[PDB]
């Protein structure tokens, strides 16, 4: 998912 959570 390119829109998966990218954050820590």
């Amino acid at each position: 998912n390119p829109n998966a959570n990218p954050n820590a």
Epitope: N1, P2, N3, A4, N5, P6, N7, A8
Partner: antibody
């Protein structure tokens, strides 16, 4: 007050390369995903790429995959976009955009002022 | 890519009016949809996400509705600061982000 400042724009011939950088201030940079978003002469907005907080994952727009590389140096709170094989369709204002941090929504709470890239012979 | 289309391209209104603008997706984006405001020479500012949730600090006169392929942004009683361009943006799972082309809210005279 979070601040994002882009640099590296200019005029370049098609096929050449250019490196953009974005310096983040007053932000725990390493906690957040970061994006590049560009705005075309027609005022259209186009998402360009995203990079994970720790650089362990990246995704790209179909338009730029294979030509652009997103990276970050969390030691210097700096985001980069390496642009190679530039096309005239890449002419735009480039903004670094912070991921707002909510797991389920890819939306941008803070934006830089943008850096202009003109691709022309 | 999913195509986002906004209607109308330009909308004329007066201070105090209620206005609604529409955003349509070429396939369902569930409620993975946000709206932004942009004025000349400035970067966009986030207004609404997940179709209907107001972002921090956004005035209560803004609201959003819709799901699937059809979404609306409503401004209940326009203020001078609201004349601007508005964009929608999806972030549907497994689909790369795209934006609508913008709707400009101009002053009627």
């Amino acid at each position: 007050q979070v601040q994002l400042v882009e640099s590296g724009g200019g005029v370049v011939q098609p096929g050449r390369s250019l490196r953009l950088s974005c310096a983040a201030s007053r932000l725990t940079f390493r906690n957040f995903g970061m994006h590049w978003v560009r705005q075309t002469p027609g005022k259209g907005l186009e998402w360009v790429a995203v990079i994970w907080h720790d650089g362990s994952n990246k995704f790209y727009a179909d338009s730029v995959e294979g030509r652009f590389t997103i990276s970050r140096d969390n030691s210097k709170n700096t985001l980069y976009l390496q642009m190679n094989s530039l096309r005239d369709e890449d002419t735009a204002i480039y903004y670094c955009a912070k991921d707002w941090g909510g797991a389920s929504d890819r939306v941008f709470d803070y934006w830089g002022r943008g850096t202009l890239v003109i691709v022309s012979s | 890519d999913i195509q986002m289309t906004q209607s109308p391209s330009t909308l004329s209104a007066s201070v105090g009016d209620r206005v609604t603008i529409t955003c349509r997706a070429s396939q369902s984006v569930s409620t993975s949809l946000a709206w932004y405001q942009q004025k000349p020479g400035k970067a966009p500012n986030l207004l609404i996400y997940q179709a209907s949730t107001l972002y921090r600090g956004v005035p209560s006169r803004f609201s959003g509705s819709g799901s699937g392929t059809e979404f609306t942004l409503t401004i209940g009683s326009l203020q001078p600061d609201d004349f601007a361009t508005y964009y929608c943006q999806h972030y549907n799972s497994y689909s790369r982000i795209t934006f609508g082309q913008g709707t400009r809210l101009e002053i009627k005279r």
